[model samples]
Target: TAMTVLTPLTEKDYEGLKRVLRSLQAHKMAWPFLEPVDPNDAPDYYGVIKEPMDLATMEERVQRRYYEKLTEFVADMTAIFDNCRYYNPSDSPFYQCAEVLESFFVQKLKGFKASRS
Candidate 1:
């Protein structure tokens, strides 16, 4: 048997995470990350980014109740920024968006923790 640590989030906390997700999606810097990058447009995207994530996919996961723990949710959210930064040049607007959005998310997480306390 495999052992794993799970940080169980209450229903209220899960709802709070959803609220944060909504706010992130509404962010202006979130435009390029709103949907999965189209392979047709960026032909090399799939090859470079094996794991792709976007705000819409995260919302779908939330709808499906796919997140068992808060860490899992955070991992997926961070993947969006990590993947973006990996694929785009640091000087690119997409990379800048990822940088900005990630900081915004960190702040929101702090707010969420405060609210929970």
Candidate 2:
């Protein structure tokens, strides 16, 4: 049998998500991901990347409680990393930044999960 379940993020969950988002946004290598890519600076960005994600946008979503599950938040974060790697070359700084940040995010998630359980 299949059942439908809808669980919204609790206040505690929001707090945890906000903590991780803030930490990532404060990262030094996070400069490029703080906001949406500027079209003037990189006109090709929108054309190449179908889904764009940034730390600030994630923060807004968290504040709005837009994520029904932690997976949604994780997915958005993953998108940020994947989009960077997809658009930038392996030798480029952007790709390297995403790689580093993705690991950092994973580490933060470890702590978040521990706190939850």
Candidate 3:
């Protein structure tokens, strides 16, 4: 009879670890742009409240602001990811997938910024 060794799989599987690593890299990459806004610069923070607005209008305003900031942050991150050449993947497809995603985000951000302008 041959004894078989079964290894327990944890939350940090290869793909899961890659996901965590990519998230960490993206957050670190985005930190410079995503820093908290100074209160002094946002003095008119509630200016939108002064206008006659319904729930949908308020939600749209908030969502638009969020989209703008997130778009910029993601643009910066994708730029970094695309330019990075030191990535070394042992045996996973995540590195290649990240490159593709980075390229996609770069194109999306470029079009978005151009449209905004």
Candidate 4:
């Protein structure tokens, strides 16, 4: 006799995942900690800051510093979620919940700086 391993997905699982996605979408729209920027602006702050930091020394340094900080923030957040999944995988009912959360956060982060004017 051979041992077998099986993992089955059910309708309840699909419903749970749908609920998580809906919650994440709602949260992304309401997060307040993100920086605000005009959505109509062609070159957003992200684009501006991503350019080479060589034009002006002071500006370059400042931009570089902020960029590094932002990078670290994102890395830390991603690690936190990944670790949470590893530690509490059973607690989550949806598959890929962590990734969905990160996606939601990124959308909010990008829109945080978006301005209406």
Candidate 5:
């Protein structure tokens, strides 16, 4: 599908993908994954899918595909931590969750130093 008046290597307009699963090209050394297709074949398969913003309009309909889990996620995390600065657990769902957040926030620190900014 050509969502933004661009893309797809066609002009005849088949009743096909306004978006295709997709492609790219290079002088691959791996053949197939690293091999180069004929120049003629490059565009035939190079139909990349559009980014979310361009894929469709913004509206309530978009929510139909994804449910907002913000409330549940927040509520559960809050209950798990109670009063601690961080929560650690053993062999439970919250264990993995805590590790992920731990990696994001320093033990007692917040973030890394800004180098270029």
Candidate 6:
């Protein structure tokens, strides 16, 4: 099976993600891509996190997935900010640095809105 190659996360991490999203939503900067397509996007969770693995793996593999998820979450968060227009402000007090991290071009994330609605 191809299961061993897959990556997963824990519920604790998921909760932390939600908290971070909300925080970022409140403190984003100016960007066109931040123009949100939908307001409901911010509060949604895609359930992308998988069950923690019971098998052992190499540090290289683990680190690879970890950083990969970091990139992906950054993008996913950018999309959410885009949907909420959080980055559309005149300027951010925390915008002292021009080191912006753009990720809105990535694919949109998944969610369980159907059942909730």
Highest lDDT: give the candidate number.
Answer: 1
Candidate 2 residue-wise lDDT, 4-114, digit = tens: 124456898789999999999888888889999998988899999999999889989998999887778889999999999998899988888998888999999888877
Clashing pairs in 5: 1-17, 1-18, 1-19, 28-34, 30-34, 31-34, 31-35
> Model 4's lDDT to the true fold?
0.38
RMSD of candidates 1 onward, in order:
3.7, 3.4, 19.4, 19.0, 20.4, 15.6
| Minimal lDDT window, size 10, model 5 | 15-24
List the global CA lDDT of all models: 0.86, 0.86, 0.36, 0.38, 0.25, 0.32
Q: Give the TM-score (vs. native) of candidate 6.
A: 0.30
Off by over 4 Å in 2: 1-8
Clash pairs for candidate 6: 34-82, 36-82, 36-83
Give stretches of model 4 more than 4 Å off.
1-68, 94-97, 112-117
Best by TM-score: 2
At residue 57, what lDDT does model 2 achieve? 90
Local accuracy of candidate 4 as per-residue lDDT tens digits, 4-109: 0122323443343334334543554323212232336424434543322111222233334432333433454454345434433455532255566667766654
Report the candidate with higher lDDT, 2 versus 4.
Answer: 2
Q: Write the per-residue lDDT of candidate 3 for residues 1-117, one digit (tens) a residue.
A: 011113222322223323422444364333322332233754642342222212233234333443234333443344344323233243434345446555555555455444333
| Clash number for each model | 0, 0, 0, 8, 7, 3
User: Which of the two candidates, 1 or 3, achieves a greater TM-score against the reference?
Assistant: 1
Winner of 1 and 5 under TM-score: 1
Every model's TM-score: 0.90, 0.92, 0.31, 0.32, 0.19, 0.30
